[PDB]
Amino acid sequence: SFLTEEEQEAIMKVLQRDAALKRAEEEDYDYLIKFLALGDSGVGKTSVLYQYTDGKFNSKFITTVGIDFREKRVVYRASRGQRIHLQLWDTAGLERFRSLTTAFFRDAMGFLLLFDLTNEQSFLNVRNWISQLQMHAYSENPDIVLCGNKSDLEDQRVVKEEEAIALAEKYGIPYFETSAANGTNISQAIEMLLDLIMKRMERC
Amino acid sequence: HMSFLTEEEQEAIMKVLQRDAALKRAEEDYDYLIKFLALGDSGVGKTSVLYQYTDGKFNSKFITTVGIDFREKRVVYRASGPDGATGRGQRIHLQLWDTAGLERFRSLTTAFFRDAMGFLLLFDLTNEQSFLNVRNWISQLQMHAYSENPDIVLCGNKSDLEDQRVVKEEEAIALAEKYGIPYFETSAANGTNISQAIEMLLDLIMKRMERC
Ligand SMILES: Nc1nc2c(ncn2[C@@H]2O[C@H](COP(=O)(O)OP(=O)(O)NP(=O)(O)O)[C@@H](O)[C@H]2O)c(=O)[nH]1
Ligand SMILES: Nc1nc2c(ncn2[C@@H]2O[C@H](COP(=O)(O)OP(=O)(O)NP(=O)(O)O)[C@@H](O)[C@H]2O)c(=O)[nH]1
Ligand SMILES: *CCC(=O)N1CCC[C@H]1c1ccc(OC)cc1
Ligand SMILES: *CCC(=O)N1CCC[C@H]1c1ccc(OC)cc1
Ligand SMILES: [Mg+2]
Ligand SMILES: [Mg+2]
């Protein structure tokens, strides 16, 4: 396989869309907040963001061409309501896109790190992903929310919940078991990441 | 049939990104981190121009850039105000991004247009097609930069190869006048106008930064 021009054109459209958005915020809403989802190919990053923004799910696998993003206007409340414009970056997991996607780790204010509860290797790769984030994000200690996705496939689960909770506590990061197919914990995990980011932004 | 990045190519790019992240964390000594980006067709001399500027050296051998790289330079900038009244020396850390011109790297390099505060747009005085593509590069910058009117300095490079020049001076000055951007004929081999073009771009960006 070769880099096609359709693949390259699609990526250029995303970057054009990103430039337009970033120029409009230069300048309605009160804050542009940027997240990035990452993890092995096929763990469900694109599905998770789609379920969150649109409440929909497609079982067919359409691997992401390098990079994409979705948007959602939401209201955040610390524990008054602030209007938040979320840019939700969606990275491709395949190694062939690794250097293009790493280039966008530095644009994110926090990270949604996914593995697949039905694929043990994706869970073992979590610590490497965290290493790459520590090496490439805006800070060596960025906010991360870990998601074990595909919780609706209980008869195919291989990652024991205890093993996942243990890993997440060792690193100090919140953990959620999610399903992009039925929406379980999706908004809870993302709202947790947003709160972690709003608090760290307030104390700046 | 554009080839995908090999694993050697990808490792080289990842090292650059690692180096950039280290640099970006250090800023949280100097007074300002300023970022430029050089772009243009493959083989016009972007890498050579930046190497001549930071190190004063030149290599005849063509080593095409593996996607993206950058060089660094600490310089002292002094504003120019009324009647040549020059201000205090400000310490500037320049990050000079160097993009590959080959199409197979276009989407990787375009991703970095948004990180630059200004652009060094090069063509090759001995290659008319490199000059004819300048208008497309500028359209690509207007579409992808932080502003639809970012600061650009146009460099016609390889001015030392006078017997191979094919770009007439008139057409390039006319193009730069039409777009409102400074134009320099440069040579990375002997240094002519290299520092003038980069200092002009730096001055443009410091002025635009002042008025914020
Ligand atoms: N049952 C179930 N299937 C899911 C879930 N999340 C994703 N999938 C399925 O798993 C496959 C991969 O999903 P996708 O979101 O494209 O994964 P990705 O992480 O974006 N892959 P890539 O990095 O290659 O773009 C798809 O067939 C999708 O339907 C989930 O929670 N439950
Ligand atoms: N005589 C002369 N040769 C030059 C000059 N600038 C570059 N060259 C030569 O032209 C070739 C290409 O230069 P290089 O800086 O690698 O070009 P580039 O724009 O970075 N190419 P790429 O986009 O593929 O990385 C090299 O052989 C280099 O020595 C110049 O001002 N004069
Ligand atoms: C207050 C400055 C800061 O570092 N923040 C705000 C919330 C998280 C963090 C941040 C991370 C990454 C970016 O990249 C745009 C901006 C802000
Ligand atoms: C005055 C504010 C501004 O837009 N500036 C300062 C100098 C150039 C310009 C700028 C462009 C792009 C970036 O991206 C990092 C920063 C600053
Ligand atoms: Mg995807
Ligand atoms: Mg080069």
Author numbering:
A (entry chain B): -35 to -9, 4 to 55, 63 to 187
B (entry chain A): -37 to -10, 4 to 187
What does the paper behind this entry write?
Rab27A and Rab27B are secretory Rabs with well-characterised roles in transport and docking of secretory vesicles (exosomes) at the plasma membrane. Rab27A promotes the growth and invasion of multiple cancer types such as breast, lung and pancreatic, by enhancing secretion of chemokines, metalloproteases and exosomes. Reported co-crystal structures show that several effectors of Rab27A interact with the Rab27A SF4 pocket (‘WF-binding pocket’) via a conserved tryptophan–phenylalanine (WF) dipeptide motif. To obtain structural insight into the ligandability of this pocket, a novel construct was designed fusing Rab27A to part of an effector protein (fRab27A), allowing crystallisation of Rab27A in high throughput.
